[PDB]
């Protein structure tokens, strides 16, 4: 891939006491895109033959891999990020009823993710062992994963990003 | 990949009463562009090996595959969206037979894509376990699933995608 | 992949009662260009592991799956668009012996690579299991399928899209 | 992928009786580059997991897929395009020591890669199967292929292509 | 990919005793990013398939391979680039609070990934067999790496460059 | 991939009886970047799962892998080109302390891949089979190779190149 081949003239700056969020904004937006590709299809994308099921269950794997794993967090980032996209092509450019309303939406979304995150991946963790007890596997059954740690790690990034993010984002929208 | 690099002189706005709808209707365009290629190969790009048959019955993942998933989801929306695409650029620029009859195309598709997608997945869902007694598959076998819980939800959202995408291309066509 | 980056000054249209064509002709080619990559690799790229052969015979998986898949639907395809594109960058500007022989040898290869196809997959169908009886596959033995059906749509998609490009590439080469 | 995305001013055509060689050869140039990445890993890019060996000794298969294959097709044409690629860069514009003598060396390596291909791949063929007697191969064992038959029809086409190319390479090497 | 396509306008060189590291530092930037994506998914890019562990303990791979590799090397060396990287866009034109302060935090993140790497990774090796006694391990079991003298190698390559990166870093920042 | 979109002004060319060596040599570092990513992950690329061992000894493939292969040939081209790819980007343009130096690092890096490889690959060549006596490799067992002959050929064309891309570098250097 690439992304971004014209940024040039740039040479006006900030004067005031104040704007100094959609710089913060702008490079977590960068930032956000970077540390993605860069770790996108290369932590969770592995995530489908790392999910070792102590059985001889037929499927029980795919059974509770959807059970514990209905979306795997890269996704709901995926989406917390294109949600919280569109105000920053808007921002791009401002000066001359949306545009606060944009700062607003990119606040909210943001807020959304976090806790509807938190309900699903309660303990902000990845456990090293899920059993399982679905209809096919039989009894309650064993079921792994891999490198529940790094997930975990990635996750408490993505997530102080989200603080920070929505914290210029709205301290930049309490001007009054 | 990377698609669109070329947007620069947009500063002329509407000032009317309407089209509100080609500001939502090329933010809907964009947006499922990102939202399919973001999660295109990454939900169904997957499920090939994921349709465990309970069964020491050669082929008949194969054969129950087919009966049960004819064509993935995916498929049928990369050509809803496709077909959907046509008018777009058309829409590109359009002041000075066909312009509101492609946005009369734009509407029958997405409706004809609904459609035909209920016609084949009935229940707006996902089976944990579809069964499955074709001719090879000696009796009444068992066929798994993974992530149906994930592909519901991405369901969910576009066809809700494709409710809004009419509601204001047959709300500016019906101007009368 | 990305194909196709520079195409911004297209505000000359046609006036006449013809050059439809190459609108339609222009968007089928495109079209198809989509339409293949997008599928390309993702409905015929996997059918290696899916000849299965009810058997003991070694290697009568590869046997008859030459004996009855000499080459794939995608390949004819790929080839016929091929052999077909060269008149497209032709096309690309016109106005000022060839010109409309390209035309023509637009129209009859494509026609060619239709009989061509019919000969081999009579029918227009993907048999959900064809049997084999070759050299090293001791008696007539089984040898399954995945996703005809699926094969099958995408078939008819492309034979039908074969039959409307000639359709308007003759038209307009029929002016007389 | 994408190869060339600049070409627009060729207004400037050709009035004598020679210099169509330059149109074929240019176009058979842009042509093998498409014939080439269209089939590219996808005829000879699986043939790793598809040279079945019946036996039980180790290792076998690698020992005789060297044997047999030293190196595909595909790499000695990526080879015969490239080594032969150089001279059309040259010819990109002429007119005003070399300049004959690059169609000779386009010439001469056609003609070494067509020679030492048939040395090694006699009969322009694709066998069934390769038997194969090798060290650790125990005795003499079997050795499958996938689709010959493919391979051969693309080895047909890329030979009958070396014919042409040369014939016109030097139709105009030979204007005395 | 891609990156970088427009460099051409550097006629003004340096002419004082110093400024010497903003050449060697951007040489180092883009050589970091060459040496990264040369041999990015290509020594790390495999290691999920070579984590061999003797035993016959479910999961026992994947748990051991989180408890030795919660994260791969080639992460932390990703990460060390990107926040070392926002100083080089900055210094990308500087004449005319920050600008030495980019140069201090490109400092100081290097260094932090130096430490908590040597924390992580100590004795700066990778040892050719990895024991492993976790819960579902049964006993203490043995693990296996592939390539660890590969790994160790480029580890000390990009060590060396840290330190160099820093001291030229620094050789400017100390600039009084 | 896509490397090189802008080379269009070099209607200077040279006169004296010099400087034939940068056009040898520019042609040389085009060359070897196609010869490489065309053949790139396509000689090397597999040779993980290549590497049979002739045991029943856990991890011993990965052991043996390592202990003939620490790193694989194409890494060492690849490092060999980037060393050697600096003094390409400043020869660039040169007419107005570096720039002969430039040339000699170019000399001495090439030298030094040369002479560390055949210190590693001693004999220029591809063992058919490579036994080992590891410790886990409870005796001498035997580890197997795929595509020794292959991988000897490539090899003998990039040592040929390395030679006479020194010797024109090296003919120039030397002008006195």
Chains 1, 2, 3, 4, 5, 6 share one sequence.
Request: aromatic share 16%; glycine share 4%; with cysteine.
């Amino acid at each position: 891939m690439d992304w971004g081949t014209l940024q040039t003239i740039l040479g006006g700056v900030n004067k005031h006491s104040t704007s100094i969020g959609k710089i913060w904004l702008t490079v977590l937006f960068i930032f956000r895109i970077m540390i993605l590709v860069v770790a996108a299809k290369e932590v969770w994308g592995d995530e489908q033959a790392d999910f070792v099921c102590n059985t001889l269950q037929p499927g029980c794997k795919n059974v509770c891999y959807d059970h514990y794993f209905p979306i795997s967090h890269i996704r709901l980032w995926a989406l917390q990020l294109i949600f919280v996209s569109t105000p920053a092509l808007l921002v791009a450019m401002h000066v001359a009823w949306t545009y606060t309303s944009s700062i607003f939406f990119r606040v909210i979304f943001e807020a959304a993710f976090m806790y509807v995150f938190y309900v699903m991946y309660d303990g902000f963790s990845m456990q090293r062992l899920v059993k399982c007890n679905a209809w096919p596997c039989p009894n309650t059954v064993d079921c792994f994963v891999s490198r529940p740690t790094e997930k975990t790690v990635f996750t408490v990034f993505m997530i102080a990003v989200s603080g920070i993010c929505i914290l210029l984002n709205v301290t930049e929208l309490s001007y009054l």
